[PDB]
Amino acid sequence: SMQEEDTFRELRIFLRNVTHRLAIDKRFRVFTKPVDPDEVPDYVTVIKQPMDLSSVISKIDLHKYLTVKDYLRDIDLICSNALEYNPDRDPGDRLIRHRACALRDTAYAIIKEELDEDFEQLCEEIQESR
Amino acid sequence: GLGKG
Numbered sequence: 001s002m003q004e005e006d007t008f009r010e011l012r013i014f015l016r017n018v019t020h021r022l023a024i025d026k027r028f029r030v031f032t033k034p035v036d037p038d039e040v041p042d043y044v045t046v047i048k049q050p051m052d053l054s055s056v057i058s059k060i061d062l063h064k065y066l067t068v069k070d071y072l073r074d075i076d077l078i079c080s081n082a083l084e085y086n087p088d089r090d091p092g093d094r095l096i097r098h099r100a101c102a103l104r105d106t107a108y109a110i111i112k113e114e115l116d117e118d119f120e121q122l123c124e125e126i127q128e129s130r
Numbered sequence: 131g132l133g134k135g
Contacts, residue, residue: 035134042132086131093131 004126008066011123015060015071018110023053028103030096031078047085051077066127068111068120079104 023032034052035043044050051074065071082100086093 040132040134043134046132088131092133 007119007122007126008063010119011065011068012060012063014115015065015068016057018107018114019053019056019060021110022103022107023057025106027099028053030099031082031103043085047081049077049081051081053078066130067123068115069124072107072111075104075107 022028032053034050034055035047037044056071056074056078059065059074060071065074079100082096086096
């Protein structure tokens with residue numbers, strides 16, 4: 001229905017705003033673009049589902065997220081990919097892991113404060129009807 | 131890990 005399309009449009013607006021706020025945070029610069037396949041050719045071998053904030057925006061605009069749960073699956077993927085690819089005790093790996101966990105925690109905290117639970121519930125119910 | 135070069 002047009003009302004349901006209005007709901008999903010509001011969801012996309014909400015998700016773009018949250019993503020932008022993550023993307024402008026200096027700590028998360030490393031997650032703003034795909035890992036460059038030409039400069040880091042091993043990355044695509046190891047990490048089976050690359051994800052980054054630019055790719056998240058593209059997915060929002062492609063209507064790939066019909067719930068905030070599905071969005072958060074991709075934020076979770078940004079985080080878990082960083083933990084997997086950079087697992088060692090050296091400070092470079094520890095820094096990227098800390099940033100990744102901070103990205104995840106920040107996204108969840110913004111959503112906790114700003115997503116109305118009944119809005120998310122409606123989204124889930126429209127999604128499950130399709 | 132393998133790093134980003």
